[PDB]
Amino acid sequence: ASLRQQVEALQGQVQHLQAAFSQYKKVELFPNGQSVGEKIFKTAGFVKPFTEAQLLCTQAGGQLASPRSAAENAALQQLVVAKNEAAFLSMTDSKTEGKFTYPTGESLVYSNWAPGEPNDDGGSEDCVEIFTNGKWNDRACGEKRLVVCEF
Amino acid sequence: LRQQVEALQGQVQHLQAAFSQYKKVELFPNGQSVGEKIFKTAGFVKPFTEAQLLCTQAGGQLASPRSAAENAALQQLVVAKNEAAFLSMTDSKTEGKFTYPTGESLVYSNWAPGEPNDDGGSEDCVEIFTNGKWNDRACGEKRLVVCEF
Amino acid sequence: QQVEALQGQVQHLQAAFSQYKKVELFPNGQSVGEKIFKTAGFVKPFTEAQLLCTQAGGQLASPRSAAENAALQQLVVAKNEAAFLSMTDSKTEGKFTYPTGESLVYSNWAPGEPNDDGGSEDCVEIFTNGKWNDRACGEKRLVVCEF
Numbered sequence: 015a016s017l018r019q020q021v022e023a024l025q026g027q028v029q030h031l032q033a034a035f036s037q038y039k040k041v042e043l044f045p046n047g048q049s050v051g052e053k054i055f056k057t058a059g060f061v062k063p064f065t066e067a068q069l070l071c072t073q074a075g076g077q078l079a080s081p082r083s084a085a086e087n088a089a090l091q092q093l094v095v096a097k098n099e100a101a102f103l104s105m106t107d108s109k110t111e112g113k114f115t116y117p118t119g120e121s122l123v124y125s126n127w128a129p130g131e132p133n134d135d136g137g138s139e140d141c142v143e144i145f146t147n148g149k150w151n152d153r154a155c156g157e158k159r160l161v162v163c164e165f
Numbered sequence: 166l167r168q169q170v171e172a173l174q175g176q177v178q179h180l181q182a183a184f185s186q187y188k189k190v191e192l193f194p195n196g197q198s199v200g201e202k203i204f205k206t207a208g209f210v211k212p213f214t215e216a217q218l219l220c221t222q223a224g225g226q227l228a229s230p231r232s233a234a235e236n237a238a239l240q241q242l243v244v245a246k247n248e249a250a251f252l253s254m255t256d257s258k259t260e261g262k263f264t265y266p267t268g269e270s271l272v273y274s275n276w277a278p279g280e281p282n283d284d285g286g287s288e289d290c291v292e293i294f295t296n297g298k299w300n301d302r303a304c305g306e307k308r309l310v311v312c313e314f
Numbered sequence: 315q316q317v318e319a320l321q322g323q324v325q326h327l328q329a330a331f332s333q334y335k336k337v338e339l340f341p342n343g344q345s346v347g348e349k350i351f352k353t354a355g356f357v358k359p360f361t362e363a364q365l366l367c368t369q370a371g372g373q374l375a376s377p378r379s380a381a382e383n384a385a386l387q388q389l390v391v392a393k394n395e396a397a398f399l400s401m402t403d404s405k406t407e408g409k410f411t412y413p414t415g416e417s418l419v420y421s422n423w424a425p426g427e428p429n430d431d432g433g434s435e436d437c438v439e440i441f442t443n444g445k446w447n448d449r450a451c452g453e454k455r456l457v458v459c460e461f
């Protein structure tokens with residue numbers, strides 16, 4: 015008897031939380047975030063060298079942007095376009111030249127290379143930047159690019 | 166069952182406390198909550214058309230204060246950033262008649278003395294000053310972007 | 315089965331909320347224990363910074379342990395701007411207290427501090443190295459609140 019009343023009580027509290035949270039999700043993503051599927055991209059709004067950007071994302075409980083589909087890539091591109099700053103992706107071929115992988119060592123399941131890329135220009139481009147047009151280019155990891163993490 | 170229900174209650178209570186803490190964190194320092202509405206500034210300026218798209222694409226719309234209370238709330242963000250902001254309303258359809266994005270007429274207004282005056286015959290947008298008063302201004306001007314959710 | 319169902323929704327809510335919390339904290343917030351530090355990203359004199367935090371429903375950063383100090387230190391380091399803490403010794407020179415009047419339960423003064431240099435340093439700033447220094451309250455420092 016009393017338990018049925020508690021259940022109905024919990025239903026009302028849960029509905030309130032769901033509604034309140036749905037509103038805050040939109041508020042939170044504006045203007046530096048993008049939701050795509052179950053992934054969320056968020057830019058720090060500034061630029062940093064690869065290693066520093068990687069650390070920022072990992073320490074925050076996530077990792078550098080790792081678009082695994084056209085949909086995620088387009089979502090990420092929106093942030094790049096908004097800030098008008100090419101961003102770093104999480105993938106590199108630092109372990110084995112010519113073989114780009116995710117931080118986990120897994121090979122890419124998606125790529126959107128601009129024509130002729132990756133080309134390891136000057137024999138020293140192991141990181142990846144995404145342009146405002148959504149295309150990718152391998153680039154020197156020492157360069158500073160917009161920091162975007164995924165959660 | 167009771168041991169489970171009591172567990173569920175514990176989870177809901179935890180969520181209520183964590184969510185309340187999170188809301189304060191989110192709103193600091195670029196948002197304002199007033200009633201069921203939330204105003205949040207992007208912290209930068211854009212022309213009207215661009216600011217409007219930014220808000221719509223984010224799932225909301227440009228700041229649309231409908232009462233003295235909401236206007237005061239929005240004013241706080243303007244004062245904080247010390248940058249006048251665009252409101253969502255315009256009289257682009259019918260000169261002399263300002264409306265919300267849906268097309269409805271204003272239910273509240275806080276015009277500065279003599280405004281709106283369509284200065285130069287080309288002011289169809291609205292800006293809110295640090296004093297909270299409104300002034301119709303050229304939509305091509307860049308103002309603080311503030312959306313409501 | 316309503317309990318089972320409702321619990322599924324709640325646990326799905328816990329997952330979504332946990333994800334949004336990490337997103338919220340990047341890159342201007344830091345969580346330590348049940349406390350959350352968040353910087354406004356700009357500087358302000360003590361009084362103004364204090365008002366902002368209280369108006370936001372929190373208070374100025376008040377690290378009460380080495381752990382909390384380390385978390386706050388991350389924000390200062392990331393922003394590369396020293397920040398004001400909530401404590402002052404305005405009521406009784408030499409005795410720093412929290413807004414509530416309670417005396418410190420933790421401190422991390424840099425060597426030689428607090429020295430009330432100039433005869434008027436009643437506020438506290440935390441450097442990028444995590445150490446504290448008493449400073450004039452009229453100076454502008456990074457605004458960091460705790461919730």
Ligand SMILES: C=CCO[C@H]1O[C@H]([C@@H](O)COC(N)=O)[C@@H](O)[C@H](O)[C@@H]1O
Nearest residue numbers: 131133134135136139151152153154
């Ligand atoms: C941007 C268009 C030119 O793009 C050329 O040069 C880029 C960098 O080498 C430029 O770096 C510097 N320091 O100039 C290469 O990544 C790219 O594949 C192409 O070979």
Ligand SMILES: C=CCO[C@H]1O[C@H]([C@@H](O)COC(N)=O)[C@@H](O)[C@H](O)[C@@H]1O
Nearest residue numbers: 280282283284285288300301302303
């Ligand atoms: C003290 C303020 C004067 O304000 C005058 O001029 C404003 C703009 O036209 C200024 O535009 C530019 N470009 O300066 C009008 O909105 C306002 O109603 C008044 O007529």
Ligand SMILES: C=CCO[C@H]1O[C@H]([C@@H](O)COC(N)=O)[C@@H](O)[C@H](O)[C@@H]1O
Nearest residue numbers: 426427429431435441447448449450
């Ligand atoms: C970075 C640590 C140096 O800290 C030195 O300088 C501080 C302020 O005087 C700095 O302010 C200005 N305007 O120079 C003193 O409070 C502190 O005891 C020490 O003498």
Ligand SMILES: [Ca+2]
Nearest residue numbers: 107108111140
């Ligand atoms: Ca290589």
Ligand SMILES: [Ca+2]
Nearest residue numbers: 107134139140
């Ligand atoms: Ca390479």
Ligand SMILES: [Ca+2]
Nearest residue numbers: 133135151152
């Ligand atoms: Ca290249």
Ligand SMILES: [Ca+2]
Nearest residue numbers: 256257260289
């Ligand atoms: Ca007109």
Ligand SMILES: [Ca+2]
Nearest residue numbers: 256283288289
């Ligand atoms: Ca007009």
Ligand SMILES: [Ca+2]
Nearest residue numbers: 282284300301
């Ligand atoms: Ca006017």
Ligand SMILES: [Ca+2]
Nearest residue numbers: 407434435436
């Ligand atoms: Ca004193």
Ligand SMILES: [Ca+2]
Nearest residue numbers: 403430435436
């Ligand atoms: Ca003193």
Ligand SMILES: [Ca+2]
Nearest residue numbers: 429431447448
């Ligand atoms: Ca000192």
